[PDB]
């Protein structure tokens, strides 16, 4: 078929699912961020989930 | 002389191996090769082990 054979399998999948999946009152909810670099800064510093 | 040099595995033999390996693909194959993606080519990285 035309479909890609390079599909991520189960660990990449578990990691990106845990990455993208939301929660209702985790930590640092409702902030307004300048961008993805500030989101990465918040997560690596520990001020947001 | 080259055969006994490789038989004793000099550091220049490992350096020449590092030069030979670079940009020389090898084919990795796993049986049973049911479809054509059971043989693929890769650029080898010299590892220990």
């Amino acid at each position: 078929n035309g479909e890609p054979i390079i599909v991520p399998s189960q660990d990449v999948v578990l990691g990106l699912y845990y990455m993208t999946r939301d929660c209702v009152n985790a930590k640092g909810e409702g902030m307004v961020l300048t961008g993805p670099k500030e989101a990465e800064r918040l997560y690596r510093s520990g001020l947001a989930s | 002389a080259a055969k006994k040099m490789v038989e004793r595995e000099e550091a220049v033999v490992w350096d020449i191996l590092d030069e030979v390996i670079r940009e020389h693909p090898v084919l990795l194959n796993r049986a049973p090769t049911l479809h054509r993606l059971g043989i693929q080519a890769f650029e080898p990285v010299l590892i220990e082990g």
């Binding site: 902030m31 307004v32 670099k37 500030e38 990465e40 800064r41 918040l42 690596r44 510093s45 | 550091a11």
Partner: protein
């Protein structure tokens, strides 16, 4: 019992505010030590000056809207968070901005002081929609360390603040993003050694290599008590 000092091989200048330094060889498991120490120090201890408070006339909270502008005052607070500033002498400079007419007010339109300079004057704060639309604000710049958010700021302050004191997230540290990795390196035979690749991107007010040297300075001055 002597160690393998790293000999620097690369400082790739991607942009004027971007760098990929590379450090090989290190001893096995030292790339993660040095990379995590430098990333932690740069993220949560490197001091600087940034926007901490702004007081716009007529507005009482961050979700109310002042007219005359096409983007919200949430966008204005975002653009004022993204502003990069450097104060030389003091730790408390109140910046006052006044603008009117058709045209987006940029960072060059601020009533600047002598001890305060802007590294990006083309940074647009907000766009104006009317000729008679006037905007007046009181940007406050403090000096702190790392990142202090508005949630922790409003947990700390408790008095009834005057009307217009909108809390903006205080991002004091000049590093915008630091991300390292550990690769494989080799001296003649052994391959257990590693190669530290630090990718750094900052705003103005500092260079990336200057910020890495400042973080190494901070860690060495933290360690210098118990050194043989």
């Amino acid at each position: 019992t002597e160690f393998l000092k790293p000999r620097l091989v690369d400082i790739e200048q991607v942009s004027s505010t971007h760098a990929k330094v590379t450090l090989e060889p290190l001893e096995r498991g030292f790339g993660h030590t040095l990379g995590n120490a430098l990333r932690r120090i740069l993220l949560s201890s490197m001091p600087g000056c940034a926007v901490t408070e702004v007081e716009i006339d007529g507005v009482l909270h961050e979700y109310s809207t002042k007219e005359g502008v096409q983007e919200d005052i949430l966008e204005i607070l975002l653009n004022l968070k993204g502003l990069a500033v450097r104060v030389q002498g003091k730790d408390e400079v109140i910046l006052t901005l006044n603008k009117s007419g058709i045209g987006p007010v940029t960072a060059a339109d601020i009533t600047h002081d002598g001890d305060v300079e802007i590294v990006k004057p083309q940074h647009v704060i907000c766009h104006l929609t009317d000729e008679n639309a006037s905007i007046s604000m009181r940007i406050k710049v403090q000096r702190g360390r790392g990142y202090v958010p508005a949630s922790t700021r409003i947990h700390s302050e408790e008095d009834e603040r005057p009307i217009g004191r909108l809390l903006v997230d205080a991002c004091y540290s000049p590093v915008e993003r630091i991300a390292y990795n550990v690769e494989a390196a080799r001296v003649e035979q052994r391959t257990d050694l590693d190669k530290l690749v630090i990718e750094m991107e900052t705003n103005g007010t500092i260079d990336p290599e200057e910020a890495i040297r400042r973080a190494a300075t901070i860690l060495a001055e933290q360690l210098e008590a118990f050194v043989d």
